[PDB]
Each structure stands twice: as structure tokens, then as C-alpha cells.
Ligand binder design. Structure first.
Ligand SMILES: Cc1cc2nc3c(=O)[nH]c(=O)nc-3n(C[C@H](O)[C@H](O)[C@H](O)COP(=O)(O)OP(=O)(O)OC[C@H]3O[C@@H](n4cnc5c(N)ncnc54)[C@H](O)[C@@H]3O)c2cc1C
Ligand SMILES: Cc1cc2nc3c(=O)[nH]c(=O)nc-3n(C[C@H](O)[C@H](O)[C@H](O)COP(=O)(O)OP(=O)(O)OC[C@H]3O[C@@H](n4cnc5c(N)ncnc54)[C@H](O)[C@@H]3O)c2cc1C
Ligand SMILES: O=C(CC(=O)c1ccccc1)CC(=O)C(F)(F)F
Ligand SMILES: O=C(CC(=O)c1ccccc1)CC(=O)C(F)(F)F
Lengths: 461, 461
């Protein structure tokens, strides 16, 4: 926490760095070191808030020279706690939030510290968008490096499927460009390979015109769980790419649109949207809403920016979280029953057992085209425990691990961006052997000393 | 646009500036010089995209030494076209979008180029907010310096009512902090006096906790205008601060929630929200939704960030705009009829005649406490023509001027941030004589040469 540093290499860093430095003695240190996963309580020797690419070069080089463990932070959403370290340096990108958008080229260049909501605001000024995650204050950086999925993904692919280049700072302090035509081996690896290869300071995306979206959210009783889940699974198998429909098993929020009868009881929350014409969307959504008897139905026609901002309306931000996630190639009636049993046990009002259906454009990309594994598995399930009181940690964590073990014969792979702090050992199985090995080769080339290891780490071959 | 610059002056600027320059021969120049108001077609000698406070110091000094007319650009929303100039320099802040939020202090520091949606994203990560306008890609900078109102204003005031300090670069290249206790004269003047005093590079705000908001929008036939507008004005006179209710008279958008037979015909779109508990909001919104026969009702409980992203769901971004706006102290039956007559003539599908009710917290601040005038007028009307085809300019512009002139006996003052490119002469009546004199005094002190004059301009002394 107070390691001895070399005064000469500290002063050279300071001279070369235009951003802000936050030391352990500083008033803002305890807030600056907090990340969204509040179970993670670590104490860096230094937080370096970078403001440009040359800042990130100076910070990488200073870390390498001084032997400080490197954490990189974009939006601080790491479910595994990777964006903070004990006794090392946090290369904190959160002030590097600039976005340039060309309407004529349908292109955006976003800095590596952007939040999604900043990005979506900027592109939507021109009625443009590209796929990203569903919660606005997530970081672009970590989300994209792992793949990135959300409402636009069935239609337009993963975030990475719209990424045309990056600017990246490597472990040796060099600044590279990677694209299809420049360092393409690195360009393959960053599209799914996390922060293993360097600090991405700029991302360039192709964009799509996305106008108003018909959206619906409704809640179903768990008494109708099997019918509603089976309807969802069957429907999604043949659904237009334009339809996205997700199920969140959770206690019913105390909202005025729901009867007070249901508040605080486990329910299915179904969220759906039509990426396309809203009149068509109204027809499509009406056709799926009666999977069970709907309660607390909200339907609206939203700019895409508002769809992105919608998830989720609650009164309190959860402090502590723990997640267990995997993909499924099929969701059987037996797995459905398992999901429903484990959902009925949910204790916290912030916890959700999520059932997502990807496929569509995501699955049309060939498997070997990027480092993102599992494109062909259309289901994702995430036991997303969240709560407030640290004395409850063992109970919440146990719930998520029990549900995972019960589902484990159905599950395959894992999204690197849903891994928890204990899941370092899941990397090889997440990627599979052929991808894991190709990534190790890229690692050997670009980060042979594994300078960047606070991630779902790929050691160099 | 191709002026002769001094090589020593230019070189000095180059050495001190770390942002991006855009020259007239560059491929991105025509896109970079476009502003939201597409009727404004100007060709600067240089666009300087600043990335830091020192960048702005360098651009200001360069402009002063070179005699280049200065445009300052935040989000580019100027109804008057002030953020681009022929032959001068645009000090372009749009890459200065960083925001730091302290949850524990309930404070945000935001750079002068931020978009609202970026700010709201950042504060909402903590369930915090402060008031700002209702269209997410508006710039923070110009909106705040003229006062800044939106959904949170009846409860929490203008943006400026939550401002605690600014960092500002003045005409002589100096960097100052202004606050209640530091350069307080300047701090008075920036709260409502526009960009007249310098380039604001950072704004610091107090924040509030703002959880889910109950929201409604519904459309009434314009045949019910008399009763709807009467209900609105009478209800708002005694309404809780928590209620905000605005009327947009427009052609009905072709949305699936509306019957096809109302598409494209004159209606009143009413939008309302309760800033407070959502069960209470449901009861309050239900009580006002029958001002006329409601059609196309949308009711939702939204995160405040989604409320901010909502305005407005349309499929096309209007290229050309023209606004005429004023305040009213009261809204008589005869003014009501005048508005309704003028609204029945609307031609473009993007044009709206807006009727806002402010009051609440905005009117509880003493009139002399900031440079914002007209606090005690609760009504704002804005004839906001918007269209696509340049051959239609004379027609749309006439509609707006005609409605304004018909209302002018009822109107007082004017919001500087709704002024059109032809309204330079409205500055003294907008502020009133005492405020305008005090502002000229502050101007003589901080901008004695009127270097910053692309704004609703206050000449010194
Ligand atoms: C509430 C919430 C909702 C989410 N929803 C979705 C969703 O809808 N879809 C989805 O796909 N994912 C989603 N996620 C998961 C998310 O993709 C991961 O948590 C992601 O890693 C977050 O990125 P970040 O920059 O915010 O996180 P951080 O904790 O800052 O970083 C995560 C990892 O990326 C690295 N990193 C970050 N920025 C850079 C960079 N610029 N260059 C190099 N390395 C970098 C870090 O070193 C770390 O290894 C969500 C997360 C949260 C917490
Ligand atoms: C679609 C739309 C919706 C709007 N809705 C609302 C609303 O709900 N509420 C409301 O109050 N207003 C609203 N407005 C009006 C708005 O407040 C003004 O248009 C505002 O001036 C825009 O600021 P900007 O930075 O985007 O514009 P710009 O055109 O970049 O700047 C406008 C003025 O401010 C100066 N300037 C900008 N940034 C700075 C800075 N950092 N320091 C010094 N000078 C600066 C410029 O020199 C210029 O004089 C809206 C505008 C638009 C176009
Ligand atoms: O739902 C998500 C995951 C998701 O990406 C998604 C959700 C709906 C539609 C498309 C994609 C965010 C979330 O709450 C999580 F906890 F899982 F992280
Ligand atoms: O009509 C508005 C709305 C506005 O400021 C407002 C709207 C609702 C509540 C409080 C304030 C401004 C705007 O976005 C426009 F450009 F059209 F003028």
C-alpha cells in the first residue's frame, strides 16, 4: 500500500502524466478504490486517472519499471473484481469518456473509459447505435473486450461484431492500431480476449440507424412458471431476429403497476422489444404477452437511448453481488423445473435468475472469426445474487452456487464477463482448447511477461 | 475561412495545445462545422477540439492574439447558431465529456463539453441527479449557463440553482474558480449570463437522490384544447412541486399506441411525471389524465435516466429549426384561444407549440440571487418550428413569427436559451434593466474587449 518507489522514475512519470494521481492518504482514495462489486475491498498503492493515450503509455511504463501489479479500470463493473488491486496501480480510464460520431460514415470512435450511456447518448444524437449492454453505467471497455451483448444483438451481433479497429497500449508501452489489416492477430484476440493484451484507449465502431422501439415488460406468477418458460424457449427457437425477449426470475418489485398482493414474492419478469417498425413491434409483442396471465404490463414506444436506460427501475443500488453463469445449447423441461425450484428460494429483492436468448446475428458469425466463444449456444443463464448486508454474504453466495451445481449437467462454457472472483479456473473451459491455445500465442507475442493479469487471464504459452 | 495567420503565434499555439485541430481542407471539416440548427451554414478558419483546461487556455490566447472571432461549442444546440462562426475559431469542447461523481458528498464535477445523457448516466450510477434539460444530446455547457430547466426543476430548481462552482477560462487566458465565496460577482453572472464571461471548463453540482419516477404521456384531440389547457393551467397553480406537466401541441406522431385515424392530425401531447414516490405518483397522474378524452396513453415507472432519454420518440432527426419563445405571468382564455388557433395551422410533423409550467422551486429563489431572469413567470411558450426542406424556410419561419406577434401582448421577457439567430435585440428585454446593467458591469471586468460575443451578448461596461 505504501511500497517504496524509485524517486527518479516517479518524477519522470509525474512529469509525463497530465491526469490525476490518487494516493492512499488522499480524502478521495476510499471512494475511488470502490468498484461495483462491493464485496471487493482492496487497497491500491496508487490510482492513476488517465486523460489521454500518452497518459496511459506513461502509466503502463511506470508500472512495468516499478513492478507494480496492474489493474485496468473502465467502468468498474467486473463481476470478479478485476479493476482494483492490493498494493499495485489502478490505470483508471474513467475520465477518458470522449466519443466522436460521424453521421456520414456511420462510425463512432469511443475512448476506452466510456460508459455505455455516454456512448448511446452520442450516437443517438444522429439516431444511430450499435450493440452494447443493457445497464447504462456499465463500462464500454471491459464489456466490449469480452464480447458484449444486449438488446441490439439478435439483430446486429455482439459489440465486437461491429468493432472495426482499436488503439491499444501494449505492455512494452508501445501504441498500436489493430484491425483486419493491421496486426490482425491482435485484432482477433481483443475481440473476446478481455484486457489480456493491452490497454484499449480507443474503439472504432460501425453504427446502425435505430429509431423508436416498441417495448413491453410484464410479470407472471411462478404458478405459471413451466408454461411461460416453455413458451419462451419454443417461441425463441423460430423468432425473427427483430424480437428480443428476456426472462428475469426475481421477487416482484413494489411498483404501482403490480398488485400489492404480489410485492416481494418470486415472479417471472419478462422484458421484450422489437428492433424495427413499432407497428410491427406492437403486433409481435401482443402475440407473446399472454404466455401466462400478464400482471403489471407496461408497453411503450421508446427511443433506443431510453430502452438502454430502462434497466432496471429500483429504489436502491445493490452493494454486494455474486454471480454464477453459463450457456446452454438446449433448455429441457427438467432444466426448466430446476430453474423454477431455485428461483422460488430467492431471498433478496435485488437478486435475479436471468434467462437470456441470444442466437440470431450472434450465431451467424463463424466461430473462429473472433475470440468470443459459445456463439452457437443460444441460452444464457445467470444466477445474479445481489444484496446489502455483509453478514448475509454466505447465504446469498450459497444460493447462487446451489443453483449452478443443480444445473451443471445442462451448462457449457461461460461468458468471461459474468465470472465471479473465485472463477479463475473457468478460463480454459470458457474459451475451449483451440481458442485458449491461439490466445496464449497472441499473449506470448504481445504480453509475454503477463503484465496484464487482472482479468480472466490467459498466461502466455 | 482561409485567413493569414502569424507563424510565431500559430507555432506557440501548436506547442501548447494537445487536442485535435480541424482545418478547412480536412475531410471531417464539413461534418464538424454543422450544428443542430441546420439553417446555420458557416465556415470557420479553424476548429480546435480541446481536451483539457490548458487546451482551452491555449485556444483563447491564440484567438485573442490572432484577432479571430471566437465561437465556443459545447453540445451545439444553440437555437441562434452561436456555436459556429464564419472565418474565426471554434473552441470545440465536445471531447471534454468527463464527469466525476462522489456518492458520499452527493457532488459531481462535469467538464464543459458534456452531453446531458453522459452526466445523467454518471450520476444515476449512484441513483443521483440534478436538474437539466429533457433532450439527452443537449450540451451541458450552454444549457447551464443560461439557467437550465427540465423534469426536476419544479422540485429542485434550475441547473444553476444546484451549481456550487465553476472553473472558467477568461479572455486574457487566465483560469479562475468562481463560487459563492470566490469571485462571487463572476459566479452570479455565469448563473444565467451565458458564455459572455469565459469558457467554462468544469461545472460542480450538488446532487439529489432520484429513484424511479412514475411517468405518463397521452394525446388529446385539439378540439378539446380549450378544456385541456384550462384544466392544466388551473391545476398547475396549486399543484405539488413533485408534479411536472407539459403540453406539446403538434401533429400526432404515427405511433402504434394511437389510432391510425389520428395520425398526422392536430393534437395536444401531454407529458407528466411525479418526482417522488411512485405509488403517490400513480394517484396524482391518474387525477390529471382526464383533462380531455385520453388517447395513446403510455404509463411507466422509469429510472430517472430513462425519463431523461425519453424525449422524444421519433424516427427522423429534424435538420432545420426556428424558435420564438416568451414567458407569461398568466394564461388567459384569450391567450389560450390564440395558441389554439395557431396550433391548428401547424404543417410540419416535427413542429411543436410547447406550453411549459415552471414555478415551484424555481420561483422560490429570490430574483436577484442569480443572473437568470423571469423566475416569477410560471408559464413558457415556445413556437418551435422544425422541418427538413430548405425551400420551406420562409413558410415555417412565418408560422412562428405570426404566432409570436399574435401573443406578444401576453408575453414578457424571454429565455436566452430559446432565442433564434435573428433575436440579438431581445437581450435587454430578456434580462430587464437592472440585471442587464449589473451583467455589463461584470462584463467590463472580465471580458472588457467583448472577446466572447457569439452568445446572447452583453456588451461591457
Ligand atoms: C449491472 C451490470 C450489467 C451488465 N450487463 C451486461 C450486458 O447486458 N451485457 C454484457 O455483455 N455484459 C454486461 N455486464 C458485464 C460486463 O460486460 C462486465 O462486467 C465488463 O467487464 C464491465 O466492464 P467495465 O469496463 O465496466 O468493468 P471494469 O471492472 O472496469 O473492467 C473489466 C475488465 O476489463 C478490463 N478493462 C476495462 N476497460 C479496459 C480497456 N479499456 N482496455 C483494457 N482492459 C480494460 C479490466 O482490466 C478488467 O479485466 C454487466 C455488468 C454489470 C455490473
Ligand atoms: C433539442 C433541444 C432541446 C432542448 N431542451 C431544453 C430543455 O429541456 N431545457 C432547457 O433549459 N434548455 C433546452 N434547450 C436549449 C438549450 O439550453 C440551449 O440550446 C443551450 O444553449 C445548448 O447548449 P449547448 O452547449 O448544446 O449549445 P452550443 O451551441 O454549443 O452553445 C450555446 C451557447 O453556450 C456557449 N457555450 C457552450 N458551452 C459553453 C461553455 N462550456 N462555456 C462557455 N460557453 C459555452 C456557446 O458559446 C453558445 O453561446 C434545448 C436545446 C435543444 C436543441
Ligand atoms: O440482462 C442482462 C444481460 C443482457 O445482456 C441482456 C438482457 C436483455 C436483452 C439482451 C441482453 C444484464 C444484467 O442484469 C446482468 F446481471 F446479468 F448482468
Ligand atoms: O419543450 C421543452 C421541454 C422542457 O423544457 C420541459 C419539459 C417538461 C418539463 C420541464 C421542462 C424544451 C425542448 O426540449 C425544446 F427544444 F423543444 F424546446
Amino acid at each position: 500500500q505504501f511500497p517504496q518507489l524509485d524517486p527518479a522514475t516517479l518524477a519522470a512519470f509525474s512529469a509525463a502524466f497530465r491526469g490525476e494521481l490518487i494516493w492512499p492518504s488522499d480524502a478521495d482514495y476510499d471512494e475511488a478504490r470502490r468498484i461495483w462489486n462491493g464485496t471487493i475491498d482492496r487497497r491500491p498503492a496508487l490510482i492513476a486517472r488517465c486523460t489521454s493515450t500518452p497518459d496511459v503509455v506513461a502509466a503502463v511504463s511506470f508500472a512495468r519499471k516499478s513492478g507494480l501489479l496492474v489493474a485496468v479500470r473502465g467502468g468498474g463493473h467486473s463481476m470478479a473484481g478485476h479493476s482494483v488491486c492490493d498494493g499495485g496501480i489502478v490505470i483508471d480510464l474513467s475520465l477518458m469518456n470522449s466519443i466522436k460520431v460521424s453521421r456520414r460514415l456511420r462510425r463512432a470512435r469511443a475512448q476506452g473509459g466510456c460508459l455505455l450511456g455516454a456512448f448511446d447518448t452520442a450516437t443517438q444524437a444522429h439516431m444511430l447505435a450499435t450493440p452494447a449492454g443493457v445497464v447504462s453505467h456499465t463500462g464500454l471497455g471491459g464489456l466490449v473486450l469480452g464480447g458484449g451483448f444486449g438488446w441490439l444483438s439478435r439483430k446486429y451481433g455482439l459489440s465486437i461484431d461491429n468493432l472495426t479497429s482499436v488503439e491499444i497500449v501494449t505492455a512494452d508501452g508501445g501504441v498500436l492500431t489493430a484491425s483486419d489489416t493491421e496486426n490482425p492477430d491482435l485484432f482477433w484476440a481483443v475481440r473476446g480476449g478481455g484486457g489480456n493484451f493491452g490497454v484499449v484507449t480507443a474503439f472504432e465502431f460501425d453504427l446502425h440507424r435505430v429509431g423508436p422501439v416498441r417495448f413491453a415488460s410484464t410479470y407472471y406468477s411462478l404458478d405459471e412458471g413451466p408454461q411461460v418458460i416453455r413458451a419462451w424457449r419454443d417461441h425463441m427457437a423460430t423468432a425473427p431476429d427483430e424480437l428480443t425477449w428476456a426472462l428475469y426470475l426475481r421477487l416482484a418489485p413494489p411498483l404501482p403497476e403490480l398488485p400489492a398482493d404480489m410485492h416481494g414474492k418470486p415472479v417471472i419478469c419478462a422484458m421484450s422489444c422489437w428492433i424495427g417498425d413499432p407497428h410491427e413491434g406492437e403486433r409481435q409483442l401482443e402475440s407473446i404477452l399472454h404466455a401466462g396471465k400478464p400482471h403489471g404490463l407496461t408497453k411503450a414506444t421508446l427511443p433506443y437511448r431510453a430502452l438502454q436506460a430502462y434497466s432496471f427501475p429500483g429504489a436502491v443500488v445493490p452493494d454486494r453481488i455474486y454471480t454464477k453463469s453459463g450457456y446452454l445449447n438446449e433448455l429441457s423441461d427438467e432444466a426448466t423445473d430446476t430453474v423454477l425450484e431455485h428461483a422460488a428460494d430467492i431471498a433478496s429483492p435485488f437478486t435475479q435468475l436471468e434467462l437470456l436468448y441470444l442466437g440470431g446475428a450472434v450465431a451467424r458469425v463463424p466461430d473462429d472469426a473472433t475470440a468470443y466463444p459459445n456463439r452457437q449456444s443460444p441460452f444464457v443463464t445467470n444466477l445474479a445474487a445481489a444484496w446489502m448486508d455483509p453478514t448475509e454474504d454466505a447465504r446469498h453466495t450459497a444460493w447462487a452456487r446451489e443453483g449452478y451445481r443443480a444445473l451443471a449437467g445442462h451448462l457449457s462454457g461461460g461468458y468471461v464477463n459474468f465470472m465471479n472472483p473465485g472463477e479463475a479456473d473457468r478460463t480454459r473451459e470458457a474459451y475451449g482448447a483451440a481458442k485458449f491455445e491461439r490466445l496464449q500465442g497472441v499473449k506470448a507475442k504481445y504480453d509475454p511477461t503477463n503484465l496484464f493479469r487482472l482479468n480472466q487471464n490467459i498466461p502466455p504459452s
